[PDB]
Amino acid sequence: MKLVIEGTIVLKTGMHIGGSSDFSAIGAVDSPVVRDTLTRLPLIPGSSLKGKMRYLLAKELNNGIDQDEILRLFGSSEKDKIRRARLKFNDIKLSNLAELETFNVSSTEVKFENTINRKTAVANPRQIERVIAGSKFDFEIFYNLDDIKEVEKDFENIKQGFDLLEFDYLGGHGTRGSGRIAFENLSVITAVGNFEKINTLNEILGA
Amino acid sequence: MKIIKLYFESPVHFGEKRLSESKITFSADTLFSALMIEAVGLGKEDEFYQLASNNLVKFSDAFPFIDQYYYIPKPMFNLKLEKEDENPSKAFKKLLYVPIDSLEDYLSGGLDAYFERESFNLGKLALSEKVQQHDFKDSEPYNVGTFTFKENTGLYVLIEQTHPLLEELLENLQYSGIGGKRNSGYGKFKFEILEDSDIEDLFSAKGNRKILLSGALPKDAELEQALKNASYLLERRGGFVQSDTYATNLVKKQDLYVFKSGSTFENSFDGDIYQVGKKGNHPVYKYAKSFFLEVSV
Amino acid sequence: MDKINLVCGSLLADIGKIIYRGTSERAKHSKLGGDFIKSFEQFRNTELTDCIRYHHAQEITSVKSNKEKNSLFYITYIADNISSGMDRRKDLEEGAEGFNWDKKVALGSVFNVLNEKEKGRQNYSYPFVAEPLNFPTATQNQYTTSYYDGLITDMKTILQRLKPDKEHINSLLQMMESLWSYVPSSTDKNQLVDISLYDHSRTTAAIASAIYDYFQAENITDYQKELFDYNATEFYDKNAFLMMNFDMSGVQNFIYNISGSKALKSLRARSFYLDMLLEYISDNLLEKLELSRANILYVGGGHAYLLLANTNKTKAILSDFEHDLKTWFLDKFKIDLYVAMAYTEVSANDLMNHNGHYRDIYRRLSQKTSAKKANRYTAEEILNLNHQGTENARECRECKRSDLLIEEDDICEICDSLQKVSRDLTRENIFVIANEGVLDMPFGKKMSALSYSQADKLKKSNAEVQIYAKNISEIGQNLMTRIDMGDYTYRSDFHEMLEEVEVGINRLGVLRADVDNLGQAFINGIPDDYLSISRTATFSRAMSRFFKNYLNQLLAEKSYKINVIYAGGDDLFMIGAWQDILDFSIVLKQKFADFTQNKLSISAGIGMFREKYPVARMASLTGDLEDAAKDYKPDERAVQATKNAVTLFDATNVFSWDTLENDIFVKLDAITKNFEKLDETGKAFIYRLIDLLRGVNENQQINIARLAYTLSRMEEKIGKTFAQELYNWANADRKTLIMALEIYILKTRERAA
Ligand SMILES: Nc1ncnc2c1ncn2[C@@H]1O[C@H](COP(=O)(O)OP(=O)(O)OP(=O)(O)O)[C@@H](O)[C@H]1O
Ligand SMILES: [Mg+2]
Ligand SMILES: [Mg+2]
């Protein structure tokens, strides 16, 4: 009844999520990225991926024409319609550490930018911390198969959300060249119970 | 007896009253609510409720374990009556959890108050800073209080006489999470049943002092006798009902005041599964059964 | 005989000490003081004068035959003996011609003998003044005759507008506190002169009141036989007093565990509410027991000690008071707030430590308080708590409770009254406790922070109106009660104050300081030989007045951008601009070390948060940092932590106060004086220095080489000598260097402020 959607997020152009507005993070860089609390490794929070995926899916499923297919996946508690959820996101830790040390490189970088005034032609630099491209994040998303007739449509929408992410960014200054990601090794396996239509769900994810 | 060891591979959010704060443990009513929600999901809430109410399954609340050291909240003992020397309950105030095996050392003194604190090192708290992105309005920020466990650290629950239904709900509870923002990336653990014989020695022993090991509320017919040479602390349990088919709107459950899970009693009591939601479509239960560890005082 | 006469005579018993060492008459101080009180017509009923004139053995013996029994001055004499302790009890009286009395000695500090088993004994004293707080100095200093003459003229001014009535006892006590606080009660060497006249007289009045009430309950009308005719051994043995232990629980959760958007504004309001709650409860119980304010040995910090009479009437009143207080607290704050009321029976020998266990008083009082806090509610209050549960769709915005809500707003009644009083909490405001007000109070009263003018048209024609003020001018008339609490607010907005600094990071600073081992100092800090109720009261008053009054005055000395939430006792909670908080941390440490002359140490935790950070998490995190500073232990071989440390923004940056000041601040000063002419590439170079220094632990060689290269790149706008200095620091004192560099980056960050 519970499916585990596995996969990997590969950074393509450098990704900047979040603000760690505590003294330790801000004392070493102007705008830090979210790190693990203990290991201090970069992570993709489940909320960030979930929110961006939901935003793209809500755009695409309406397209100027939320709806039930979004509320059943991500939940709702607004005023009278309360669907709990079917997708259970998890905080995505950095999986490429031993691979990144073979390159003698740190997992994070500082990108030096600036803005140039248009009235006075005066520039002003800024630094943003960013998770370097080539970093990998293995994620697990748990699906609660509440309905047997809607699982195929839910997984079609999940694949659509992943595809929309692949042609978008994930966190931070995306339109200025950051946060481009790719999805690889996408698969779904039944963790609890028996589900004979897991093969077609893998076909949807492997599409 | 059948210690349910929880290994968390994500930061947890166990809220007391606010989303910006997290506590390192979760209570027995929280675990019971999680398992009852799982049972509703897989359609045998009545069987689980009958198991819990008939004492077929009764569990303590989550306690820290650090490298095969099982901890217990510092019991509220009527001792410190050693009125000559030492620092009884003076340096034993920042000490929140004592090892379950070292409880006899703590009873008669000699436990190092300082050393028991830096030895107790389970993860650390953090605040996750988030927003609700609005496409044309101003994005509204919000933050979640989280706790991240360490490598060889987690939580454990004392269950005696485990059940197939409890094991089946625990397997499903792996992939739904426990705690506050579990549908976000916060509720994620692995569990083991891990029968233990050292702990069974402690719980097979009798004594004149009963350490309450779960948030419990004695029934009205036994509260008076429970309150007799008792050294307890009263805790409020409540919050919003978490269900889809209740009241069609968010409603808080009734506040239940129970004995905190470090309290010590001389008279044993068995609590109850209290119904803290009665105006909705389904009952809402608050697990307040008593889990006791007996010692000599 | 009237009890008020005994109270006034015991308060003014040593009036003649200041009278005698202020003028030139050469007579016994009791006689001179009796004549001085005789100079006022309202203070003339022969009972006042009998208590003032005859409170010593020789004077009583000279007139005991002529005076009748139960004459109220035996009580004052025995109360003076009890308050003295192991000090002089029956010897020559000041002003007599059998000795040469030095009328010019200053009072010593109580910290001269505090912790002397490990820190030694020393001879400090207070220089005379004329607030402001008087600090102790090692230099020997004298009290000129002009000092006591000015004291005498101010006392003549105040005493003309005073009466021996019930409502003027507070005014008399305020006079004594203002004037006698810095005059010795004994100008005799070969002993300790550290007891003030105010503390000695207050203890004597409290003991005399308790003894009188005990005597009335026990039906004793032979004070001469029972006290003076013999050495009062039988009286000294019997338990005539009660030591009571008002103890408030859950103040941290009530004050700081809130989640409103405007939750920073209400912190001071909640702290003030709890402080005045405790003060009002103590005053109410005192007036229910017909006792004076002198019987409050200590109040503040969510704790109150009262000296009572071991009588059945007192115990019945205590039971009724406790029941009413418990019901009121349960009604308003279900379990969030609680006051524990425990008392123990003590004897005059216990108070004087003659039997050797004066400390057992507080030992068993603490035992009783812990026993009462372990079993707070009976098995009917819990039942009522569980039965008054309702399913609610609404809850308080910041107090998150579903009861006592307002019909048009999701906020609790306490939660709205606190916001109101926070809006009316400003400088030079007094507090009125009447039947009408804003904040709910126990026993059917309400409290407002309304101003002076609209308070004058509230007591001139009304019944049972109580006025509380921070400052009292013209002590005699306009009867108020002075309440002390740290409440210095530079600016209550908390937002314009942040947008007042121009250089630095836009961060709030939270300071939480706490004296290390103050309870241990109260237990065994004072040597057993110098143990008395007067010395204990002197130490308690020193600590409390320091925190409240002197923190206010010190923060007012220079315009620190601080918004003190609570000072109280032994603790401190202040929020302000993080640079001002960091600058004031060292000033606070130095001022405390001067005031105690290094007999007690203080631990602090400094947190740095943004404006919109949750106030509950600010409090919790800064408390964690303060606990980490209290965990400071440089070597893992000693017993108990050193505790004399400060935590800087994170539990890993725990440094001792000497280490912080010397190392970190000289490094920060050098960095500031050498880095001001760096370019904007130099800022990135400092960032890289910090990263390399942090990574040095896992990269021994390559990272130190990279640091050398970075210093090479930098040593064109900073100089070669400072590059070498930084390189030497990095290999010798790295964590201090990292701390200083991070502080410099945050202080010089050009991201507004
Ligand atoms: N009005 C106040 N405002 C702010 N802080 C206060 C106030 N009154 C007291 N405090 C401080 O709060 C600290 C803890 O008080 P609290 O009663 O919540 O815990 P506690 O001392 O451990 O007592 P208990 O064991 O009964 O809970 C004390 O150090 C006290 O100085
Ligand atoms: Mg207390
Ligand atoms: Mg302290």
Ligand SMILES: [Mg+2]
């Ligand atoms: Mg304290």
